[PDB]
Design a protein around this ligand. Structure first.
Ligand code: MG
Ligand code: MG
Ligand code: MG
Ligand code: MG
Ligand code: MG
Ligand code: MG
Length: 59
RNA sequence: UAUCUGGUUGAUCCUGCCAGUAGUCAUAUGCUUGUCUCAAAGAUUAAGCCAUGCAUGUCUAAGUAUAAGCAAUUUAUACAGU
C-alpha cells in the first residue's frame, strides 16, 4: 500500500553536479565528450522578464 | 628665593611638646557661584552583587553562489552584473 504522496509523488534534486568529474559521473560520457553540453540551467521569471541562471563548472 | 609666633611662672631663661602657619595632580564635605580655556570622576568600604541593552567581527577585478534573491539591458546557453 502506497502512502498518499511519500512513495507516490517525487521531489527532484535541488542541484546538479558542479565538478566536471561529477558531471561525467551523472551521465557516463568519457573524456572526449566535454562539459557545457549537459548542464542544468534554471530559468527564472521576475514577472514579465524571463532570464537564465547556470552553474559555474569548477575544474 | 633657607621666615617663625601663642601656651608651663609672680616674673626669668630653657627642655619640651601642644596650637597656629603654608601647601597637596589628597579626599570629603559646608555655604556660595556670572564668564571663558582645560578637563579628573565607584581606587580607597565589599576583586560585593547584578536585571536590561551594547561591548569583535571580516570579501576583494582576484578561495567557495543554480539565493526558486536583486537584476534587465543592446557580451553569453558553459560561468562572465551586483
Ligand atoms: Mg576555478
Ligand atoms: Mg613646672
Ligand atoms: Mg600664669
Ligand atoms: Mg601642627
Ligand atoms: Mg559668552
Ligand atoms: Mg570596588
Amino acid at each position: 500500500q502506497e502512502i498518499e504522496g511519500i512513495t507516490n509523488d517525487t521531489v527532484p534534486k535541488r542541484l546538479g553536479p558542479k565538478r566536471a568529474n561529477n558531471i561525467r559521473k551523472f551521465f557516463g560520457l568519457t573524456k572526449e565528450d566535454d562539459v557545457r553540453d549537459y548542464v542544468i540551467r534554471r530559468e527564472v521569471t521576475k514577472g514579465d522578464k524571463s532570464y537564465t541562471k547556470a552553474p559555474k563548472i569548477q575544474r
